[PDB]
Amino acid sequence: RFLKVKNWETDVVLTDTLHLKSTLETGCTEHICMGSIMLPVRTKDQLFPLAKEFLDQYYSSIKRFGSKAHMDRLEEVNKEIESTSTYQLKDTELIYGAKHAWRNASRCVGRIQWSKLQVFDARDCTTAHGMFNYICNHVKYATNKGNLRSAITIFPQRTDGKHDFRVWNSQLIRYAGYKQPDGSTLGDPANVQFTEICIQQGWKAPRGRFDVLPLLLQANGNDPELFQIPPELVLEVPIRHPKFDWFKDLGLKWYGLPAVSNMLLEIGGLEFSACPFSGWYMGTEIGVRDYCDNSRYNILEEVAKKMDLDMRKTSSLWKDQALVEINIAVLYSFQSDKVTIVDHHSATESFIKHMENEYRCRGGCPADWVWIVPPMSGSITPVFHQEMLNYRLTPSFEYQPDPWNTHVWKG
Amino acid sequence: RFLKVKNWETDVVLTDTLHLKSTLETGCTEHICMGSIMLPTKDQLFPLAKEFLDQYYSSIKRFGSKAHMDRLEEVNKEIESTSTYQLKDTELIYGAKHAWRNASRCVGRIQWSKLQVFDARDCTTAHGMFNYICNHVKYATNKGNLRSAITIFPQRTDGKHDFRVWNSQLIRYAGYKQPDGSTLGDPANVQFTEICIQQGWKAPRGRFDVLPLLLQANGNDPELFQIPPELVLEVPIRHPKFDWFKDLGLKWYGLPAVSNMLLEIGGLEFSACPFSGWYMGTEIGVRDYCDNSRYNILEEVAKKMDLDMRKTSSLWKDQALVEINIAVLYSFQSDKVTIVDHHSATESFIKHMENEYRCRGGCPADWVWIVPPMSGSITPVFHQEMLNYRLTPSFEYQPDPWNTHVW
Ligand code: HEM
Ligand code: HEM
Ligand SMILES: N=C(Nc1cccc(CNCCc2cccc(F)c2)c1)c1cccs1
Ligand SMILES: N=C(Nc1cccc(CNCCc2cccc(F)c2)c1)c1cccs1
Ligand SMILES: C[C@H](O)[C@H](O)[C@H]1CNc2nc(N)[nH]c(=O)c2N1
Ligand SMILES: C[C@H](O)[C@H](O)[C@H]1CNc2nc(N)[nH]c(=O)c2N1
Ligand SMILES: OC[C@@H](O)[C@@H](O)[C@H](O)[C@H](O)CO
Ligand SMILES: OC[C@@H](O)[C@@H](O)[C@H](O)[C@H](O)CO
Ligand SMILES: OC[C@@H](O)[C@@H](O)[C@H](O)[C@H](O)CO
Ligand SMILES: [Zn+2]
């Protein structure tokens, strides 16, 4: 079967066949669309078809499908599964699987970059101190003094589910949040619960507005351990505005390296529960979401005050006005400090070219419109006008529950 | 089977049961979400009529009463014999309000119970349609203090005698493809403009020519009518800070009135059912003015603001976008023509979703359409999970009549 998507700005029509390869399910049915819902231990039985399907995809991409190397590899994996109940990926297959999980990430606007990903193989890691060292190395390589390079570090896969590797942090670099007795929050409200867990575990909290959290690392299903990233490895940008000289006095800064550490990477039925990955920011992530969500740093009022906008009525668009100035400031600052960042115009235009290329060479590009459209100026970006099809391909990044909700404490 | 929607800003979780009542399909499957796609006989009729009458009688606390059973029998009788049926005035009104209530893409539904229903089922000719429409325009405009209204023309019979308004909105501007190769006026309406011309309209060929009405009664050939200028309230667009803004020569009309949809009630189909409310400001300032395939004025505005248009990362488009939208709201407000800003409208909609969950068990909502086209995440709907599903009575899309009509 074929499916068409149309761009309503350009009338360009594209044809999807890739959706035929989708296996995992969406949450939607013929009677209900779940497209705006935020959230979407294996047998030998289920494992061999997953491995075969993956290895067939890998062998086709290297133009060796049905070769002797292909056939021998299938047999080698089959034997390993029934003998040891699982299997190990070769290095090339791991690299391919990690890149493809990114290529297949339908909520990712940055996928034009998918084939340029540095893969660090950390499957020989055994302790949390080992994990600390791997993570430091990742951050230093990815940071590259501001010329950010995409990277992923892949700790040992799941075995019985009782020996998981996990990074408890939601991002490798992120700011603490502290709920005060009077009910206000100091620092980042998104991270209060995790900050509380760190303190409980022994972290000496500085209790300021931008304290970089310590790493909380779990190796081999053991209790997690606390480490501090060396400050010299944490690149940060003070935020200032090109015209508004009072902007600096808001005391804002943000870190340069976005590094997601709480997702699960699934490759050929194997589950990599610790797989921190990093790229670079699109400006709106910081200027719109981190700074301006009511439940995050919530700076809109203070900024509009300093801009002396008319705040008596929403219809003066004071929020919209302040929003734009803050976002200009974020891009200005990163650019001035030579730290990689992309604006939402550049990013969405690049995504449309990526998507079209993918339709032509791959037969499709699964994409989640709700997530691809930026959180400001939606319709003056080309993605707003682009119909998209959302489906799930493997290899993939998947959500997993926060580990404090599942961990069996050893004590 | 019982479904939860979470607001990620406030943590409020609501439980949806209303979706189990859904009849029509979504376009989605368990393998593919089509959430962002723009357009996804007598035997068929009695179940649809029964389902409708059941909800109607339930709504007036008379479910399973003799009045209920009697009407079911009566309509049954009437379909058996006539192959269709007629709604009582009360049922028609209820059904129209509920088609609005059920419109998953409509952010303004807090208003749904306040809809003036004009029954034009006695209408027979295009001149008659013109008269009803003028009366609707004048009633709804109410000198700037806009009132929601729908005018309902006769229902489909054998489908060869359709009433249709060929216009996509009652009031809209013409578009003219030019020797130049550029488009003068509104590029969305080029095709319709030409049809009007080719039917004999004498076009002024300006930037903001109010289209004539192209009205089709009883499956006959459509006829042209000019809406009395005095009934078309228009707003000149100026900015409260930029004195130069007025020199752009921008205006818009006060009355948004959709005329190309099909109203489905209890299986009956009302193919001409023009309906009107009032604007959310972004519709004009973001979409009408700034879409690339529309008036596309971002470049000229940015220029008058002397912004650095060298780099996308200066956010010159974004800055100009906000100013254009400030001007739209200020101009409508200054002239006392009802308008709602996107902050106000989306705040209302969250309150309405909460009412509907509390009083009806749910509220179908299409997040892709509900979130405004600017400043998405600073409005509360951005953070609100929504379930989309199709309830009847409903408004439905239908093919443009010129593709279908046999002249
Ligand atoms: C190279 C620069 C990149 C940019 C600018 C970028 C941009 C983004 C942004 C803006 C989002 C949405 C984030 C949010 O609102 O929470 C996102 C989602 C995502 N991207 Fe990227 N991306 C990049 C690289 C990467 C890399 C290197 C990977 C993994 C190898 C990745 C995988 C993802 C995934 C899995 C999501 C979805 C997260 C979820 O569902 O919660 N991206 N991308
Ligand atoms: C009273 C003020 C109202 C406001 C502010 C309002 C707001 C809106 C907006 C902004 C849209 C999106 C339109 C677009 O982007 O093209 C919309 C969609 C819609 N509204 Fe309303 N609405 C109002 C009243 C009404 C009324 C009176 C009806 C019907 C009786 C109605 C039925 C619809 C329908 C059916 C759609 C979806 C059209 C489609 O799917 O293409 N609304 N509403
Ligand atoms: N630019 C980036 N941003 C990014 C990419 C993927 C994921 C994320 C973080 N997503 C947060 C999702 C989330 C979590 C908790 C609550 C919530 F509302 C939303 C951020 C990158 C991070 C890593 C590589 S690129
Ligand atoms: N404020 C209004 N706006 C509005 C409400 C419903 C529908 C519309 C017009 N929608 C046009 C959607 C559309 C269709 C086909 C192609 C396209 F690009 C865009 C506008 C109202 C119109 C009537 C009552 S409220
Ligand atoms: C409820 C809704 O799905 C939720 O707010 C989504 C909307 N779109 C998003 N898009 C991105 N990129 N990131 C997000 O966190 C969200 N949040
Ligand atoms: C392709 C995409 O579905 C399309 O551009 C939609 C997105 N959301 C929208 N939302 C509204 N309210 N109106 C629209 O016309 C659209 N267009
Ligand atoms: O404070 C705890 C949160 O940071 C955490 O629960 C995240 O929201 C979660 O890891 C998803 O990002
Ligand atoms: O916490 C809700 C959002 O504000 C948050 O997830 C941001 O979008 C994220 O930090 C962007 O990178
Ligand atoms: O033509 C595509 C859109 O610009 C258009 O449908 C507007 O969104 C509409 O006129 C707003 O009322
Ligand atoms: Zn769906």
mmCIF file of C-alpha atoms in Angstrom, chain B residues 6-308:
data_model
loop_
_atom_site.group_PDB
_atom_site.id
_atom_site.type_symbol
_atom_site.label_atom_id
_atom_site.label_comp_id
_atom_site.label_asym_id
_atom_site.label_seq_id
_atom_site.Cartn_x
_atom_site.Cartn_y
_atom_site.Cartn_z
ATOM 1 C CA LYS B 6 -2.998 14.694 31.699
ATOM 2 C CA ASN B 7 -2.186 18.389 31.715
ATOM 3 C CA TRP B 8 1.662 18.507 31.902
ATOM 4 C CA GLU B 9 1.704 22.062 33.311
ATOM 5 C CA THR B 10 -0.811 21.595 36.164
ATOM 6 C CA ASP B 11 -0.764 17.818 36.704
ATOM 7 C CA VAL B 12 -4.605 17.725 36.508
ATOM 8 C CA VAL B 13 -5.721 14.345 35.075
ATOM 9 C CA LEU B 14 -9.175 13.950 33.528
ATOM 10 C CA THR B 15 -10.913 10.673 32.634
ATOM 11 C CA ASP B 16 -12.595 10.265 29.248
ATOM 12 C CA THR B 17 -15.563 7.958 28.750
ATOM 13 C CA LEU B 18 -17.369 9.948 26.083
ATOM 14 C CA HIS B 19 -15.136 8.488 23.383
ATOM 15 C CA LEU B 20 -16.891 5.131 23.722
ATOM 16 C CA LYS B 21 -19.944 6.821 22.202
ATOM 17 C CA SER B 22 -17.932 7.678 19.070
ATOM 18 C CA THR B 23 -19.311 6.334 15.803
ATOM 19 C CA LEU B 24 -17.253 7.676 12.858
ATOM 20 C CA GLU B 25 -13.590 6.710 12.177
ATOM 21 C CA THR B 26 -10.352 8.749 12.562
ATOM 22 C CA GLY B 27 -7.988 7.867 9.756
ATOM 23 C CA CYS B 28 -5.580 6.392 12.334
ATOM 24 C CA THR B 29 -4.746 2.725 12.956
ATOM 25 C CA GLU B 30 -2.661 0.889 15.572
ATOM 26 C CA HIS B 31 0.178 1.026 13.020
ATOM 27 C CA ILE B 32 -0.029 4.661 11.903
ATOM 28 C CA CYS B 33 -1.191 7.997 13.284
ATOM 29 C CA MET B 34 -2.750 10.353 10.767
ATOM 30 C CA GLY B 35 -3.173 13.140 13.353
ATOM 31 C CA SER B 36 -1.577 15.816 11.142
ATOM 32 C CA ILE B 37 -3.367 15.034 7.785
ATOM 33 C CA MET B 38 -5.706 17.962 6.854
ATOM 34 C CA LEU B 39 -8.547 15.850 5.315
ATOM 35 C CA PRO B 40 -8.904 12.288 6.636
ATOM 36 C CA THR B 41 -30.526 4.533 1.543
ATOM 37 C CA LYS B 42 -33.390 3.882 3.976
ATOM 38 C CA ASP B 43 -31.640 1.023 5.850
ATOM 39 C CA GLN B 44 -28.718 3.196 6.919
ATOM 40 C CA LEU B 45 -31.013 5.990 8.055
ATOM 41 C CA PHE B 46 -33.142 4.532 10.845
ATOM 42 C CA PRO B 47 -30.204 3.568 13.122
ATOM 43 C CA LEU B 48 -28.808 7.102 12.711
ATOM 44 C CA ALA B 49 -32.183 8.694 13.491
ATOM 45 C CA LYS B 50 -32.676 6.475 16.578
ATOM 46 C CA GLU B 51 -29.198 7.205 17.949
ATOM 47 C CA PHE B 52 -29.932 10.927 17.550
ATOM 48 C CA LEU B 53 -33.442 10.886 19.049
ATOM 49 C CA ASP B 54 -32.131 8.807 21.951
ATOM 50 C CA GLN B 55 -29.551 11.462 22.825
ATOM 51 C CA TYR B 56 -32.086 14.256 22.282
ATOM 52 C CA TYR B 57 -34.656 12.684 24.607
ATOM 53 C CA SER B 58 -31.947 11.900 27.092
ATOM 54 C CA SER B 59 -30.870 15.570 27.036
ATOM 55 C CA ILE B 60 -34.396 16.724 28.008
ATOM 56 C CA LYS B 61 -34.640 14.077 30.787
ATOM 57 C CA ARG B 62 -37.372 12.125 28.950
ATOM 58 C CA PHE B 63 -35.446 9.036 27.874
ATOM 59 C CA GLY B 64 -37.832 6.072 27.478
ATOM 60 C CA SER B 65 -40.955 8.201 28.042
ATOM 61 C CA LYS B 66 -44.074 7.928 25.883
ATOM 62 C CA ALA B 67 -43.098 11.158 24.037
ATOM 63 C CA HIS B 68 -39.734 9.488 23.279
ATOM 64 C CA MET B 69 -41.216 6.167 22.067
ATOM 65 C CA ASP B 70 -43.920 7.979 20.068
ATOM 66 C CA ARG B 71 -41.426 10.143 18.126
ATOM 67 C CA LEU B 72 -39.162 7.149 17.390
ATOM 68 C CA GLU B 73 -42.224 5.354 15.967
ATOM 69 C CA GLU B 74 -43.261 8.478 13.974
ATOM 70 C CA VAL B 75 -39.844 8.904 12.344
ATOM 71 C CA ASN B 76 -39.678 5.193 11.719
ATOM 72 C CA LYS B 77 -43.072 5.474 10.006
ATOM 73 C CA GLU B 78 -41.856 8.432 7.946
ATOM 74 C CA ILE B 79 -38.588 6.871 6.714
ATOM 75 C CA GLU B 80 -40.429 3.624 5.831
ATOM 76 C CA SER B 81 -42.812 5.647 3.658
ATOM 77 C CA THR B 82 -40.916 8.750 2.469
ATOM 78 C CA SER B 83 -37.318 7.362 2.666
ATOM 79 C CA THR B 84 -36.308 10.417 4.749
ATOM 80 C CA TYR B 85 -37.730 12.424 7.682
ATOM 81 C CA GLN B 86 -38.071 15.969 8.992
ATOM 82 C CA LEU B 87 -36.636 17.221 12.273
ATOM 83 C CA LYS B 88 -38.787 19.169 14.720
ATOM 84 C CA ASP B 89 -37.551 22.716 15.308
ATOM 85 C CA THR B 90 -36.377 21.716 18.777
ATOM 86 C CA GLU B 91 -34.382 18.759 17.379
ATOM 87 C CA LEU B 92 -32.830 20.900 14.637
ATOM 88 C CA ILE B 93 -31.658 23.529 17.138
ATOM 89 C CA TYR B 94 -30.315 20.837 19.487
ATOM 90 C CA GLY B 95 -28.506 19.144 16.591
ATOM 91 C CA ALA B 96 -26.876 22.334 15.332
ATOM 92 C CA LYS B 97 -25.652 23.270 18.812
ATOM 93 C CA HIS B 98 -24.308 19.785 19.210
ATOM 94 C CA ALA B 99 -22.507 19.733 15.863
ATOM 95 C CA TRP B 100 -20.615 22.801 17.209
ATOM 96 C CA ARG B 101 -20.131 21.161 20.654
ATOM 97 C CA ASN B 102 -18.649 18.113 18.872
ATOM 98 C CA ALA B 103 -16.282 20.068 16.594
ATOM 99 C CA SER B 104 -12.892 18.719 17.766
ATOM 100 C CA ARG B 105 -10.940 21.370 15.947
ATOM 101 C CA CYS B 106 -12.799 24.380 17.405
ATOM 102 C CA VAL B 107 -11.137 26.296 20.258
ATOM 103 C CA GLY B 108 -14.207 28.533 20.836
ATOM 104 C CA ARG B 109 -16.643 25.912 21.991
ATOM 105 C CA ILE B 110 -17.194 27.376 25.507
ATOM 106 C CA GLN B 111 -19.798 29.339 23.595
ATOM 107 C CA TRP B 112 -21.517 26.315 22.074
ATOM 108 C CA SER B 113 -24.908 26.658 23.812
ATOM 109 C CA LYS B 114 -25.319 30.283 22.647
ATOM 110 C CA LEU B 115 -26.025 29.827 18.914
ATOM 111 C CA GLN B 116 -28.849 31.499 17.111
ATOM 112 C CA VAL B 117 -30.355 29.017 14.715
ATOM 113 C CA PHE B 118 -32.110 30.397 11.586
ATOM 114 C CA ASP B 119 -34.347 27.742 10.068
ATOM 115 C CA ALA B 120 -34.293 28.300 6.309
ATOM 116 C CA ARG B 121 -35.756 24.919 5.441
ATOM 117 C CA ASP B 122 -38.631 26.666 3.646
ATOM 118 C CA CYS B 123 -36.216 28.237 1.146
ATOM 119 C CA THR B 124 -36.631 27.405 -2.597
ATOM 120 C CA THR B 125 -34.523 29.764 -4.756
ATOM 121 C CA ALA B 126 -31.166 31.511 -4.896
ATOM 122 C CA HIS B 127 -32.691 34.936 -4.372
ATOM 123 C CA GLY B 128 -34.344 33.430 -1.242
ATOM 124 C CA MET B 129 -30.937 32.127 -0.126
ATOM 125 C CA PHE B 130 -29.498 35.595 -0.662
ATOM 126 C CA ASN B 131 -32.199 37.126 1.563
ATOM 127 C CA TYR B 132 -31.654 34.598 4.410
ATOM 128 C CA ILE B 133 -27.869 35.142 4.177
ATOM 129 C CA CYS B 134 -28.122 38.939 4.324
ATOM 130 C CA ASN B 135 -30.370 38.626 7.356
ATOM 131 C CA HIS B 136 -27.852 36.256 8.981
ATOM 132 C CA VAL B 137 -24.952 38.688 8.186
ATOM 133 C CA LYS B 138 -26.826 41.640 9.683
ATOM 134 C CA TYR B 139 -27.989 39.691 12.772
ATOM 135 C CA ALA B 140 -24.539 38.214 13.446
ATOM 136 C CA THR B 141 -22.624 41.497 12.883
ATOM 137 C CA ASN B 142 -24.935 43.437 15.240
ATOM 138 C CA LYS B 143 -22.869 46.591 14.627
ATOM 139 C CA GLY B 144 -19.594 45.025 15.824
ATOM 140 C CA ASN B 145 -20.981 43.181 18.829
ATOM 141 C CA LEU B 146 -20.897 39.822 17.057
ATOM 142 C CA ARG B 147 -23.354 37.002 17.801
ATOM 143 C CA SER B 148 -22.928 33.351 16.834
ATOM 144 C CA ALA B 149 -25.514 32.179 14.280
ATOM 145 C CA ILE B 150 -26.168 29.389 11.745
ATOM 146 C CA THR B 151 -28.622 29.430 8.812
ATOM 147 C CA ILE B 152 -29.859 26.013 7.778
ATOM 148 C CA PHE B 153 -31.087 25.485 4.208
ATOM 149 C CA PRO B 154 -33.056 22.440 3.042
ATOM 150 C CA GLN B 155 -31.545 18.965 3.614
ATOM 151 C CA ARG B 156 -30.206 16.685 0.853
ATOM 152 C CA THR B 157 -32.891 14.535 -0.844
ATOM 153 C CA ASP B 158 -31.678 12.441 -3.788
ATOM 154 C CA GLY B 159 -28.451 14.451 -4.026
ATOM 155 C CA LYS B 160 -29.347 15.992 -7.419
ATOM 156 C CA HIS B 161 -31.170 18.889 -5.715
ATOM 157 C CA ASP B 162 -28.453 20.084 -3.306
ATOM 158 C CA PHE B 163 -28.462 23.522 -1.778
ATOM 159 C CA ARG B 164 -24.900 24.860 -1.674
ATOM 160 C CA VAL B 165 -23.114 28.166 -1.058
ATOM 161 C CA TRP B 166 -20.172 27.942 -3.423
ATOM 162 C CA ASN B 167 -18.160 30.472 -1.387
ATOM 163 C CA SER B 168 -15.822 28.998 1.262
ATOM 164 C CA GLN B 169 -16.788 31.906 3.691
ATOM 165 C CA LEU B 170 -19.677 34.370 3.232
ATOM 166 C CA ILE B 171 -17.306 37.280 3.344
ATOM 167 C CA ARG B 172 -13.909 36.868 1.685
ATOM 168 C CA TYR B 173 -11.487 38.692 -0.654
ATOM 169 C CA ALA B 174 -10.867 37.889 -4.349
ATOM 170 C CA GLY B 175 -7.570 36.671 -5.794
ATOM 171 C CA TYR B 176 -6.293 37.393 -9.304
ATOM 172 C CA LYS B 177 -3.398 35.587 -10.993
ATOM 173 C CA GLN B 178 -1.523 38.276 -12.942
ATOM 174 C CA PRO B 179 0.456 38.910 -16.200
ATOM 175 C CA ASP B 180 3.243 39.821 -13.814
ATOM 176 C CA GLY B 181 3.001 36.223 -12.498
ATOM 177 C CA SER B 182 2.345 37.515 -9.008
ATOM 178 C CA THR B 183 -1.033 37.286 -7.338
ATOM 179 C CA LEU B 184 -3.077 40.357 -6.497
ATOM 180 C CA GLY B 185 -5.299 40.053 -3.414
ATOM 181 C CA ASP B 186 -5.882 36.732 -1.670
ATOM 182 C CA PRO B 187 -4.150 33.745 -3.381
ATOM 183 C CA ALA B 188 -6.387 31.229 -1.551
ATOM 184 C CA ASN B 189 -9.398 32.323 -3.595
ATOM 185 C CA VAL B 190 -7.956 32.605 -7.081
ATOM 186 C CA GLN B 191 -9.944 29.634 -8.402
ATOM 187 C CA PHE B 192 -13.263 30.795 -6.907
ATOM 188 C CA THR B 193 -12.633 34.336 -8.131
ATOM 189 C CA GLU B 194 -12.256 33.082 -11.711
ATOM 190 C CA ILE B 195 -15.447 31.030 -11.424
ATOM 191 C CA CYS B 196 -17.293 34.183 -10.323
ATOM 192 C CA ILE B 197 -15.759 36.126 -13.247
ATOM 193 C CA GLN B 198 -16.651 33.339 -15.693
ATOM 194 C CA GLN B 199 -20.210 33.340 -14.329
ATOM 195 C CA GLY B 200 -20.232 37.063 -15.115
ATOM 196 C CA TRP B 201 -19.066 38.971 -12.026
ATOM 197 C CA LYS B 202 -17.405 42.254 -12.915
ATOM 198 C CA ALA B 203 -14.263 42.154 -10.795
ATOM 199 C CA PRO B 204 -12.789 45.467 -9.527
ATOM 200 C CA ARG B 205 -9.344 43.764 -9.502
ATOM 201 C CA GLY B 206 -8.104 45.240 -6.188
ATOM 202 C CA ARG B 207 -6.276 43.810 -3.165
ATOM 203 C CA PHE B 208 -9.398 43.477 -1.013
ATOM 204 C CA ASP B 209 -12.455 42.926 -3.197
ATOM 205 C CA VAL B 210 -15.330 41.344 -1.257
ATOM 206 C CA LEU B 211 -16.427 38.313 -3.210
ATOM 207 C CA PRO B 212 -19.990 38.033 -4.476
ATOM 208 C CA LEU B 213 -22.104 35.157 -3.265
ATOM 209 C CA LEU B 214 -22.518 32.186 -5.574
ATOM 210 C CA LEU B 215 -25.695 30.503 -4.463
ATOM 211 C CA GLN B 216 -27.168 27.197 -5.513
ATOM 212 C CA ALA B 217 -30.765 26.303 -4.773
ATOM 213 C CA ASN B 218 -32.299 22.895 -5.426
ATOM 214 C CA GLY B 219 -29.382 21.569 -7.433
ATOM 215 C CA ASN B 220 -29.896 24.369 -9.957
ATOM 216 C CA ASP B 221 -27.111 26.367 -11.536
ATOM 217 C CA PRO B 222 -25.613 28.855 -9.037
ATOM 218 C CA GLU B 223 -26.321 32.627 -9.304
ATOM 219 C CA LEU B 224 -24.370 35.747 -8.276
ATOM 220 C CA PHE B 225 -25.386 38.350 -5.645
ATOM 221 C CA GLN B 226 -23.472 41.217 -4.152
ATOM 222 C CA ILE B 227 -23.833 41.510 -0.313
ATOM 223 C CA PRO B 228 -24.912 45.047 0.487
ATOM 224 C CA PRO B 229 -21.636 46.890 1.295
ATOM 225 C CA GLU B 230 -23.371 48.441 4.262
ATOM 226 C CA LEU B 231 -23.706 44.923 5.757
ATOM 227 C CA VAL B 232 -19.991 44.070 5.496
ATOM 228 C CA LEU B 233 -18.220 45.492 8.512
ATOM 229 C CA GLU B 234 -14.507 45.892 7.706
ATOM 230 C CA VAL B 235 -11.602 47.010 9.942
ATOM 231 C CA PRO B 236 -8.671 49.136 8.772
ATOM 232 C CA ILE B 237 -5.481 47.776 10.380
ATOM 233 C CA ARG B 238 -3.272 50.175 12.324
ATOM 234 C CA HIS B 239 -0.675 49.733 15.078
ATOM 235 C CA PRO B 240 -0.805 51.436 18.521
ATOM 236 C CA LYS B 241 2.903 52.338 18.298
ATOM 237 C CA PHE B 242 3.943 52.249 14.615
ATOM 238 C CA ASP B 243 2.387 55.224 12.853
ATOM 239 C CA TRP B 244 3.634 53.834 9.497
ATOM 240 C CA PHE B 245 1.551 50.615 9.857
ATOM 241 C CA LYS B 246 -1.594 52.151 8.280
ATOM 242 C CA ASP B 247 0.423 52.948 5.114
ATOM 243 C CA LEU B 248 0.550 49.209 4.405
ATOM 244 C CA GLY B 249 -3.105 49.644 3.389
ATOM 245 C CA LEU B 250 -4.271 46.520 5.293
ATOM 246 C CA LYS B 251 -7.853 45.786 6.260
ATOM 247 C CA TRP B 252 -9.861 42.728 7.246
ATOM 248 C CA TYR B 253 -13.577 41.891 7.690
ATOM 249 C CA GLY B 254 -15.152 41.483 11.130
ATOM 250 C CA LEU B 255 -17.436 38.474 10.442
ATOM 251 C CA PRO B 256 -15.890 35.031 9.901
ATOM 252 C CA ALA B 257 -18.653 32.882 8.407
ATOM 253 C CA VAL B 258 -17.891 29.378 7.107
ATOM 254 C CA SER B 259 -20.189 28.368 4.273
ATOM 255 C CA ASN B 260 -18.715 25.226 2.621
ATOM 256 C CA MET B 261 -19.308 22.604 5.324
ATOM 257 C CA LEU B 262 -21.981 19.964 5.686
ATOM 258 C CA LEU B 263 -24.073 19.653 8.844
ATOM 259 C CA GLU B 264 -25.080 16.075 9.696
ATOM 260 C CA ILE B 265 -27.956 15.539 12.113
ATOM 261 C CA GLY B 266 -29.575 12.150 12.829
ATOM 262 C CA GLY B 267 -28.428 10.914 9.413
ATOM 263 C CA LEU B 268 -29.841 13.925 7.554
ATOM 264 C CA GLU B 269 -27.415 16.086 5.576
ATOM 265 C CA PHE B 270 -27.571 19.862 5.410
ATOM 266 C CA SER B 271 -25.192 20.759 2.578
ATOM 267 C CA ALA B 272 -25.763 24.544 2.924
ATOM 268 C CA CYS B 273 -25.439 25.594 6.598
ATOM 269 C CA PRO B 274 -23.380 28.803 6.742
ATOM 270 C CA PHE B 275 -22.279 29.535 10.348
ATOM 271 C CA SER B 276 -20.490 32.464 11.984
ATOM 272 C CA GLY B 277 -18.902 33.485 15.346
ATOM 273 C CA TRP B 278 -15.981 35.903 15.664
ATOM 274 C CA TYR B 279 -12.256 35.810 15.065
ATOM 275 C CA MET B 280 -9.366 34.694 17.146
ATOM 276 C CA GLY B 281 -6.685 37.300 16.328
ATOM 277 C CA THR B 282 -4.061 34.806 15.040
ATOM 278 C CA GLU B 283 -6.385 33.681 12.244
ATOM 279 C CA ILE B 284 -5.942 37.075 10.537
ATOM 280 C CA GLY B 285 -2.539 38.234 11.826
ATOM 281 C CA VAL B 286 -0.658 34.915 11.684
ATOM 282 C CA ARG B 287 -2.435 32.892 8.983
ATOM 283 C CA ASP B 288 -4.223 35.350 6.621
ATOM 284 C CA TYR B 289 -1.409 37.955 6.731
ATOM 285 C CA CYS B 290 1.749 35.843 7.130
ATOM 286 C CA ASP B 291 1.283 32.461 5.483
ATOM 287 C CA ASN B 292 3.552 32.280 2.457
ATOM 288 C CA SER B 293 0.702 31.313 0.178
ATOM 289 C CA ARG B 294 -1.544 34.033 1.631
ATOM 290 C CA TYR B 295 -1.046 37.836 1.927
ATOM 291 C CA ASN B 296 2.548 36.966 2.958
ATOM 292 C CA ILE B 297 3.404 40.410 4.310
ATOM 293 C CA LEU B 298 6.225 39.481 6.715
ATOM 294 C CA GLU B 299 8.993 40.824 4.455
ATOM 295 C CA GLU B 300 7.396 44.276 3.931
ATOM 296 C CA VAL B 301 6.612 44.694 7.651
ATOM 297 C CA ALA B 302 10.129 43.651 8.733
ATOM 298 C CA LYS B 303 11.486 46.231 6.248
ATOM 299 C CA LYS B 304 9.388 49.067 7.714
ATOM 300 C CA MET B 305 10.679 47.979 11.142
ATOM 301 C CA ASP B 306 14.277 48.111 9.802
ATOM 302 C CA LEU B 307 15.155 44.711 11.280
ATOM 303 C CA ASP B 308 18.272 42.791 10.297
#
